[PDB]
């Protein structure tokens, strides 16, 4: 319904917010993966 | 009864669920990054 238009807009925006957060966490996880690989190479 | 209402409520609940899961993952991720940064600085 048109009464739900504001809720729906906010839901779509919230998906944008969560996607961006997960993308950012993925890039930090990729950094953590390579940080551990380099530490393993240096330690072992 | 507005027919899409129960789906909309569940979508909003699901966004809460996903946000809480992302927030918990971020705590574990920042602990992992700190451990990496701490080992890098401490190793001779």
């Amino acid at each position: 319904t048109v009464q739900a238009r504001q809720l729906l807009s906010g839901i779509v925006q919230q998906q944008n917010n969560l996607l961006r957060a997960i993308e950012a966490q993925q890039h930090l996880l990729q950094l953590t993966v390579w940080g551990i690989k380099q530490l393993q190479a240096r330690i072992l | 009864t507005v027919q899409a209402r129960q789906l909309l409520s569940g979508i909003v609940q699901q966004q809460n669920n996903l946000l809480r899961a992302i927030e918990a993952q971020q705590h574990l991720l920042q602990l992992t990054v700190w451990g990496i940064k701490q080992l890098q600085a401490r190793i001779l």
């Binding site: 809720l7 906010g10 | 927030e23 971020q26």
Partner: peptide, 26 residues
């Protein structure tokens, strides 16, 4: 991490708005 923290802050505000809107819709 600072990028992530700001995004989660925005998500928390939006979640509060959506929950207010859902309650008012009901």
């Amino acid at each position: 991490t600072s990028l992530i923290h700001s995004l989660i802050e925005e998500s928390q505000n939006q979640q509060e708005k959506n929950e207010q809107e859902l309650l008012e819709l009901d």
